Short mmCIF file of C-alpha atoms in Angstrom, two decimals:
data_model
loop_
_atom_site.label_atom_id
_atom_site.label_comp_id
_atom_site.label_asym_id
_atom_site.label_seq_id
_atom_site.Cartn_x
_atom_site.Cartn_y
_atom_site.Cartn_z
CA UNK A 1 0.19 -0.17 -0.04
CA UNK A 2 1.90 2.60 -0.90
CA UNK A 3 2.50 6.43 0.48
CA UNK A 4 0.27 9.79 -0.94
CA UNK A 5 2.09 11.06 -3.76
CA UNK A 6 5.39 12.46 -2.44
CA UNK A 7 6.37 16.31 -2.45
CA UNK A 8 8.77 17.91 -4.95
CA UNK A 9 12.26 18.28 -4.00
CA UNK B 1 28.91 10.93 -13.51
CA UNK B 2 29.19 7.56 -11.40
CA UNK B 3 29.48 4.71 -13.14
CA UNK B 4 30.17 1.00 -11.50
CA UNK B 5 30.60 -1.66 -13.91
CA UNK B 6 27.98 -4.88 -14.22
CA UNK B 7 29.15 -7.58 -12.25
CA UNK B 8 27.72 -11.19 -14.03
CA UNK B 9 26.86 -14.53 -12.94
CA UNK B 10 25.45 -17.12 -15.39
CA UNK B 11 24.16 -20.04 -13.83
CA UNK B 12 21.07 -22.72 -13.71
CA UNK B 13 17.96 -22.41 -11.97
CA UNK B 14 18.12 -26.37 -10.64
CA UNK B 15 21.47 -28.45 -11.50
CA UNK B 16 22.15 -29.99 -14.23
CA UNK B 17 21.96 -32.78 -16.04
CA UNK B 18 21.92 -33.36 -19.77
CA UNK B 19 18.81 -33.32 -22.59
CA UNK B 20 16.67 -32.17 -18.96
CA UNK B 21 14.63 -28.83 -19.18
CA UNK B 22 15.72 -26.08 -17.09
CA UNK B 23 16.22 -22.62 -16.73
CA UNK B 24 19.65 -20.70 -17.57
CA UNK B 25 20.16 -17.44 -15.60
CA UNK B 26 22.25 -14.41 -15.98
CA UNK B 27 21.98 -12.16 -12.83
CA UNK B 28 23.40 -8.55 -13.33
CA UNK B 29 24.61 -6.79 -9.62
CA UNK B 30 26.21 -3.92 -8.75
CA UNK B 31 25.87 -1.18 -12.11
CA UNK B 32 25.17 2.61 -12.75
CA UNK B 33 23.32 4.09 -14.66
CA UNK B 34 20.60 1.55 -15.14
CA UNK B 35 20.38 1.24 -19.31
CA UNK B 36 22.15 -2.16 -20.03
CA UNK B 37 21.84 -4.56 -22.65
CA UNK B 38 21.91 -8.33 -22.04
CA UNK B 39 21.61 -11.19 -24.29
CA UNK B 40 22.02 -14.45 -23.95
CA UNK B 41 23.71 -17.27 -26.00
CA UNK B 42 23.52 -20.61 -27.27
CA UNK B 43 26.38 -20.97 -29.60
CA UNK B 44 26.98 -17.84 -29.95
CA UNK B 45 23.55 -16.82 -31.50
CA UNK B 46 21.02 -14.48 -29.42
CA UNK B 47 17.99 -16.34 -27.86
CA UNK B 48 15.40 -14.92 -28.43
CA UNK B 49 12.22 -16.02 -26.03
CA UNK B 50 14.34 -14.03 -22.53
CA UNK B 51 12.26 -12.83 -20.04
CA UNK B 52 13.68 -10.16 -17.12
CA UNK B 53 13.49 -9.02 -13.69
CA UNK B 54 11.59 -5.94 -12.91
CA UNK B 55 14.51 -3.43 -12.19
CA UNK B 56 15.36 -2.48 -8.20
CA UNK B 57 18.48 -1.60 -6.77
CA UNK B 58 20.06 -2.65 -3.46
CA UNK B 59 21.80 -0.03 -0.77
CA UNK B 60 24.50 1.60 -1.79
CA UNK B 61 22.11 2.38 -5.03
CA UNK B 62 23.28 0.08 -7.55
CA UNK B 63 20.41 -2.29 -10.29
CA UNK B 64 20.38 -5.33 -10.18
CA UNK B 65 18.49 -7.52 -12.99
CA UNK B 66 17.73 -11.45 -14.36
CA UNK B 67 17.75 -12.19 -17.12
CA UNK B 68 16.14 -16.50 -17.81
CA UNK B 69 15.51 -18.55 -20.15
CA UNK B 70 13.84 -21.73 -20.50
CA UNK B 71 17.20 -24.30 -21.85
CA UNK B 72 17.18 -28.14 -22.08
CA UNK B 73 21.41 -28.44 -20.97
CA UNK B 74 23.93 -31.29 -23.32
CA UNK B 75 27.19 -32.36 -22.79
CA UNK B 76 28.47 -29.92 -25.65
CA UNK B 77 26.67 -27.31 -26.39
CA UNK B 78 27.99 -23.27 -25.09
CA UNK B 79 25.93 -21.13 -23.23
CA UNK B 80 26.75 -17.88 -22.29
CA UNK B 81 25.91 -14.25 -21.72
CA UNK B 82 26.56 -11.24 -22.99
CA UNK B 83 26.26 -7.68 -21.52
CA UNK B 84 27.60 -4.28 -22.87
CA UNK B 85 26.80 -1.48 -20.69
CA UNK B 86 28.74 2.34 -21.04
CA UNK B 87 31.80 1.08 -18.43
CA UNK B 88 32.63 -1.41 -20.91
CA UNK B 89 34.35 -0.71 -24.30
CA UNK B 90 32.58 -4.02 -25.18
CA UNK B 91 30.28 -6.41 -24.45
CA UNK B 92 31.24 -9.27 -22.08
CA UNK B 93 30.84 -12.81 -22.37
CA UNK B 94 30.62 -14.49 -19.74
CA UNK B 95 30.60 -18.85 -20.61
CA UNK B 96 27.75 -21.03 -18.04
CA UNK B 97 29.99 -23.54 -16.44
CA UNK B 98 27.81 -25.70 -14.86
CA UNK B 99 29.46 -26.34 -11.41
CA UNK B 100 29.36 -22.21 -10.36
CA UNK C 1 10.58 -13.34 12.99
CA UNK C 2 11.01 -9.90 11.48
CA UNK C 3 9.41 -8.29 8.38
CA UNK C 4 9.32 -5.59 5.77
CA UNK C 5 7.32 -3.81 3.52
CA UNK C 6 9.26 -1.44 1.07
CA UNK C 7 9.29 0.33 -2.04
CA UNK C 8 11.91 1.25 -4.58
CA UNK C 9 11.28 3.26 -7.60
CA UNK C 10 13.66 4.58 -10.20
CA UNK C 11 12.93 7.39 -12.73
CA UNK C 12 15.59 8.09 -16.03
CA UNK C 13 15.26 11.27 -18.24
CA UNK C 14 15.58 11.04 -22.45
CA UNK C 15 16.62 14.21 -23.17
CA UNK C 16 15.95 13.60 -26.40
CA UNK C 17 12.09 12.96 -27.13
CA UNK C 18 9.56 12.72 -24.36
CA UNK C 19 9.17 11.45 -20.37
CA UNK C 20 11.51 9.78 -18.07
CA UNK C 21 10.90 6.35 -18.11
CA UNK C 22 9.94 5.41 -14.38
CA UNK C 23 10.22 1.67 -12.70
CA UNK C 24 8.04 1.15 -9.28
CA UNK C 25 8.59 -2.13 -7.56
CA UNK C 26 6.87 -3.02 -4.17
CA UNK C 27 8.51 -5.81 -1.79
CA UNK C 28 7.08 -7.92 1.85
CA UNK C 29 10.31 -9.34 2.92
CA UNK C 30 12.24 -10.81 -0.57
CA UNK C 31 9.44 -10.88 -2.52
CA UNK C 32 8.28 -8.94 -4.90
CA UNK C 33 4.02 -8.03 -5.00
CA UNK C 34 3.86 -5.83 -7.10
CA UNK C 35 5.17 -3.51 -9.91
CA UNK C 36 4.60 -0.42 -11.82
CA UNK C 37 6.32 0.60 -15.53
CA UNK C 38 5.86 3.62 -17.71
CA UNK C 39 6.24 1.70 -21.07
CA UNK C 40 4.45 -0.64 -20.44
CA UNK C 41 0.70 -1.42 -22.17
CA UNK C 42 -1.70 -1.10 -18.92
CA UNK C 43 -0.01 1.89 -17.44
CA UNK C 44 -1.65 0.18 -13.84
CA UNK C 45 -0.42 -1.04 -10.67
CA UNK C 46 0.52 -4.69 -11.88
CA UNK C 47 0.55 -7.91 -9.12
CA UNK C 48 3.82 -9.75 -8.82
CA UNK C 49 3.15 -12.70 -7.18
CA UNK C 50 -0.63 -14.31 -6.63
CA UNK C 51 -1.52 -13.45 -2.90
CA UNK C 52 -2.19 -9.75 -3.94
CA UNK C 53 -4.49 -11.29 -6.52
CA UNK C 54 -7.06 -10.87 -3.58
CA UNK C 55 -7.53 -7.22 -3.88
CA UNK C 56 -10.46 -5.75 -5.30
CA UNK C 57 -10.72 -2.95 -7.86
CA UNK C 58 -10.25 -0.27 -5.59
CA UNK C 59 -6.95 -1.01 -4.42
CA UNK C 60 -5.32 -0.88 -8.01
CA UNK C 61 -7.28 1.93 -8.93
CA UNK C 62 -6.04 3.67 -5.87
CA UNK C 63 -2.54 2.09 -5.96
CA UNK C 64 -2.61 3.06 -9.58
CA UNK C 65 -3.48 6.72 -9.04
CA UNK C 66 -0.59 7.16 -5.97
CA UNK C 67 2.01 5.56 -8.11
CA UNK C 68 1.55 8.07 -11.24
CA UNK C 69 1.66 10.63 -8.36
CA UNK C 70 4.77 9.74 -7.95
CA UNK C 71 6.48 9.21 -11.65
CA UNK C 72 4.90 13.20 -11.99
CA UNK C 73 7.23 13.66 -8.63
CA UNK C 74 9.67 12.40 -9.83
CA UNK C 75 9.91 14.13 -13.54
CA UNK C 76 9.55 17.07 -11.92
CA UNK C 77 12.76 15.99 -10.05
CA UNK C 78 14.76 15.73 -12.72
CA UNK C 79 13.79 18.83 -13.79
CA UNK C 80 14.47 20.86 -10.93
CA UNK C 81 17.45 18.58 -9.85
CA UNK C 82 19.47 19.41 -13.05
CA UNK C 83 18.94 23.24 -12.34
CA UNK C 84 20.14 23.12 -9.23
CA UNK C 85 23.23 21.40 -9.74
CA UNK C 86 23.65 23.13 -12.95
CA UNK C 87 23.60 20.87 -16.09
CA UNK C 88 22.86 21.42 -19.44
CA UNK C 89 19.61 19.73 -21.19
CA UNK C 90 21.36 17.35 -23.17
CA UNK C 91 22.66 14.45 -20.50
CA UNK C 92 20.11 11.10 -18.90
CA UNK C 93 20.20 11.63 -15.30
CA UNK C 94 18.28 9.43 -12.24
CA UNK C 95 16.34 10.25 -10.14
CA UNK C 96 15.97 6.42 -7.13
CA UNK C 97 13.47 6.61 -4.28
CA UNK C 98 12.75 3.81 -1.04
CA UNK C 99 11.00 3.79 1.57
CA UNK C 100 9.27 1.28 3.43
CA UNK C 101 8.70 -0.02 7.70
CA UNK C 102 10.47 -2.77 9.42
CA UNK C 103 8.03 -4.51 12.07
CA UNK C 104 9.34 -7.36 14.27
CA UNK C 105 8.91 -11.07 15.56
CA UNK C 106 5.16 -9.38 17.25
CA UNK C 107 4.77 -7.42 14.36
CA UNK C 108 4.49 -4.52 15.21
CA UNK C 109 6.44 -1.07 14.33
CA UNK C 110 10.44 -1.21 14.41
CA UNK C 111 11.27 1.54 11.93
CA UNK C 112 10.89 3.28 9.16
CA UNK C 113 12.84 4.92 6.13
CA UNK C 114 12.11 7.25 3.62
CA UNK C 115 15.37 7.39 1.53
CA UNK C 116 16.20 9.81 -2.03
CA UNK C 117 18.95 9.81 -4.59
CA UNK C 118 20.49 11.73 -7.90
CA UNK C 119 22.46 9.80 -10.39
CA UNK C 120 23.45 6.72 -7.60
CA UNK C 121 24.77 8.84 -4.65
CA UNK C 122 22.55 10.12 -1.57
CA UNK C 123 20.46 13.14 -2.21
CA UNK C 124 18.23 13.50 1.28
CA UNK C 125 17.04 10.64 3.24
CA UNK C 126 14.44 11.02 6.08
CA UNK C 127 16.60 10.67 9.73
CA UNK C 128 15.56 6.93 11.85
CA UNK C 129 13.36 9.75 14.20
CA UNK C 130 11.05 9.97 11.78
CA UNK C 131 11.56 13.77 12.64
CA UNK C 132 14.21 15.25 10.56
CA UNK C 133 15.91 14.90 7.68
CA UNK C 134 19.40 14.30 6.84
CA UNK C 135 20.67 16.40 3.18
CA UNK C 136 23.88 15.16 1.53
CA UNK C 137 24.92 18.72 0.24
CA UNK C 138 23.33 22.31 -0.52
CA UNK C 139 21.09 21.41 -3.00
CA UNK C 140 19.74 18.88 -0.75
CA UNK C 141 20.02 21.41 1.60
CA UNK C 142 17.21 23.72 0.12
CA UNK C 143 14.94 20.92 -0.58
CA UNK C 144 15.26 19.97 3.56
CA UNK C 145 14.38 23.70 4.43
CA UNK C 146 11.38 22.85 1.40
CA UNK C 147 10.48 19.93 2.99
CA UNK C 148 10.27 21.24 6.58
CA UNK C 149 8.09 24.28 6.02
CA UNK C 150 5.60 21.94 4.19
CA UNK C 151 5.35 19.55 7.53
CA UNK C 152 6.30 16.67 5.38
CA UNK C 153 8.17 14.61 7.87
CA UNK C 154 4.44 14.66 9.81
CA UNK C 155 2.65 13.10 7.14
CA UNK C 156 5.46 10.71 6.32
CA UNK C 157 5.80 9.94 10.21
CA UNK C 158 1.71 9.20 9.60
CA UNK C 159 2.67 6.58 6.87
CA UNK C 160 5.67 4.46 7.94
CA UNK C 161 4.05 3.95 11.86
CA UNK C 162 0.25 3.41 10.54
CA UNK C 163 -0.87 2.75 7.61
CA UNK C 164 2.42 0.44 6.04
CA UNK C 165 2.22 -1.32 9.03
CA UNK C 166 -1.96 -2.39 9.28
CA UNK C 167 -1.10 -3.30 5.11
CA UNK C 168 2.31 -4.99 6.11
CA UNK C 169 -0.12 -7.68 8.37
CA UNK C 170 -3.19 -7.88 6.65
CA UNK C 171 -0.25 -8.87 3.29
CA UNK C 172 1.71 -11.23 5.65
CA UNK C 173 -2.11 -13.22 6.99
CA UNK C 174 -2.80 -13.13 3.34
CA UNK C 175 -0.07 -14.54 1.76
CA UNK C 176 1.16 -16.55 4.66
CA UNK C 177 1.53 -20.11 3.31
CA UNK C 178 4.27 -18.35 1.46
CA UNK C 179 5.52 -15.11 3.47
CA UNK C 180 5.47 -17.17 6.83
CA UNK C 181 7.35 -20.23 5.60
CA UNK C 182 10.76 -20.51 5.84
CA UNK C 183 12.62 -22.37 2.78
CA UNK C 184 15.98 -23.95 4.44
CA UNK C 185 18.72 -24.41 2.15
CA UNK C 186 19.19 -27.44 0.79
CA UNK C 187 23.59 -28.25 1.03
CA UNK C 188 25.78 -30.33 -0.21
CA UNK C 189 29.56 -30.10 -1.53
CA UNK C 190 31.50 -30.38 -4.51
CA UNK C 191 34.58 -31.69 -4.96
CA UNK C 192 37.70 -30.83 -8.12
CA UNK C 193 40.43 -31.64 -8.88
CA UNK C 194 42.29 -28.24 -9.18
CA UNK C 195 45.67 -30.79 -10.06
CA UNK C 196 47.48 -33.76 -8.38
CA UNK C 197 48.21 -31.80 -5.40
CA UNK C 198 45.14 -29.49 -4.46
CA UNK C 199 41.40 -29.58 -4.68
CA UNK C 200 38.65 -27.25 -4.95
CA UNK C 201 35.88 -27.25 -2.98
CA UNK C 202 32.26 -25.98 -2.81
CA UNK C 203 29.55 -26.18 -0.31
CA UNK C 204 26.04 -24.90 -1.73
CA UNK C 205 23.20 -24.09 -0.38
CA UNK C 206 20.13 -23.61 -2.58
CA UNK C 207 16.53 -23.49 -2.76
CA UNK C 208 16.37 -21.54 0.11
CA UNK C 209 14.13 -18.29 1.65
CA UNK C 210 14.79 -15.16 2.74
CA UNK C 211 18.08 -14.48 1.08
CA UNK C 212 19.96 -13.69 3.98
CA UNK C 213 22.25 -16.85 4.78
CA UNK C 214 26.31 -17.00 5.99
CA UNK C 215 28.34 -19.65 4.78
CA UNK C 216 32.35 -20.02 6.22
CA UNK C 217 35.03 -22.11 5.57
CA UNK C 218 36.72 -23.21 8.89
CA UNK C 219 39.47 -25.46 9.42
CA UNK C 220 39.97 -27.98 11.40
CA UNK C 221 38.00 -25.72 13.44
CA UNK C 222 38.72 -21.89 12.77
CA UNK C 223 37.83 -19.43 10.42
CA UNK C 224 38.90 -19.79 7.01
CA UNK C 225 39.26 -16.76 4.55
CA UNK C 226 42.59 -17.24 2.84
CA UNK C 227 41.75 -19.33 -0.42
CA UNK C 228 38.17 -18.77 -0.07
CA UNK C 229 35.84 -17.32 -2.57
CA UNK C 230 32.36 -17.11 -1.81
CA UNK C 231 29.62 -15.16 -4.68
CA UNK C 232 26.94 -13.48 -4.25
CA UNK C 233 23.61 -14.59 -3.03
CA UNK C 234 21.58 -14.78 -6.44
CA UNK C 235 18.05 -15.46 -7.12
CA UNK C 236 17.28 -18.82 -8.34
CA UNK C 237 14.03 -17.08 -10.45
CA UNK C 238 11.14 -19.56 -8.55
CA UNK C 239 11.48 -16.58 -5.27
CA UNK C 240 14.12 -18.58 -3.85
CA UNK C 241 18.20 -17.70 -3.39
CA UNK C 242 21.07 -19.68 -4.14
CA UNK C 243 24.62 -18.96 -2.95
CA UNK C 244 27.95 -20.84 -2.35
CA UNK C 245 31.71 -21.15 -1.13
CA UNK C 246 34.97 -22.46 -2.29
CA UNK C 247 37.79 -23.05 -0.37
CA UNK C 248 41.64 -24.53 -2.11
CA UNK C 249 42.89 -27.04 -0.38
CA UNK C 250 46.12 -29.95 -0.18
CA UNK C 251 44.79 -33.11 -1.66
CA UNK C 252 44.25 -35.74 1.13
CA UNK C 253 43.41 -32.67 3.97
CA UNK C 254 39.26 -32.49 2.60
CA UNK C 255 38.05 -33.87 6.04
CA UNK C 256 39.96 -31.01 8.00
CA UNK C 257 37.50 -28.51 6.09
CA UNK C 258 33.97 -27.55 7.34
CA UNK C 259 31.41 -25.47 5.65
CA UNK C 260 28.81 -23.74 8.10
CA UNK C 261 25.23 -22.43 7.02
CA UNK C 262 23.82 -20.28 9.00
CA UNK C 263 20.34 -19.25 8.33
CA UNK C 264 16.45 -18.41 9.81
CA UNK C 265 15.64 -21.78 8.27
CA UNK C 266 17.68 -23.79 10.20
CA UNK C 267 16.95 -23.98 14.17
CA UNK C 268 20.55 -24.94 14.28
CA UNK C 269 23.39 -23.94 11.59
CA UNK C 270 23.99 -27.37 9.37
CA UNK C 271 28.02 -28.49 9.18
CA UNK C 272 29.18 -30.46 6.24
CA UNK C 273 32.63 -32.59 5.92
CA UNK C 274 33.61 -33.61 2.67
CA UNK C 275 33.51 -37.79 2.64
CA UNK C 276 30.23 -38.55 1.11
#
């Protein structure tokens, strides 16, 4: 179960 | 930028017995960047029905992949894995040895 | 024993034309269970183990939306980092991400991790407390500041300590028949006459799961390192692993040497000694 969409660098 | 050459192991899934069906594996690991060309050879020619794993990588970020195909060893047929990568000036061929 | 769930993501820019190539894999322990590949036709998160096929279409819709969100974040990062590092738009670059959680025997949270790399080197990583970041250089330091102002650690922590563990447990229960079976290595020893005066003994460990194993040679009860070779642990292709270790010995002295094998699936380590 993936994490929510990550935050950009 | 930071290039790591592939380690190559060529081996069968199961102990090799002439005339019995088996899987030939070429395991390439420890390389970066990810683009790589891997062929399996029978007596010099590229085998067509070769499958590979999904790209993943290790603790030091280096990539690994498994290539494999179905085969039937015999006394005299040569099998091998040929690999090309930006870190190699020419493709490297690694012969299968039953005992390794 | 202990378990983990981990995801691996790779993106490779294609300056000549189009979007980056993106590949994602998930694992429970050493078992791959899902994949996504931007170049495959489905454009969906796909099962790679039978016990995940259980999951209904909302699972798969959800995972598919999330994984695409990951590929787009990486695509933006490839552009941002090329500018932070002052690189030309001509070359191909790579971003890599890995995160997940471990649980102990008791299936309670043990630890979580989230790490990110650019061109094969550490860029930024979550610290063990899951509240703060490790940046490797001044570009990553800029990313650290952005993620701190945006409270990224909190929300990761909520997932690593909560959601991740909860799903790991559900998968362990659903994939019980394999995921909670350990397969002890099948071992044997081979003998190769190198010359009239030396021989090689090779100790094999086959068809074992999980991948963690130790093979060590001893001579008259003490560890030996000189004149040995140890191959890296390698996948058999059916979900188990293989390894071997070899030692060169004077011919006629084979009985002095012993191979010791340790693995989670073995109550006692095994000892092998030549004379079948």
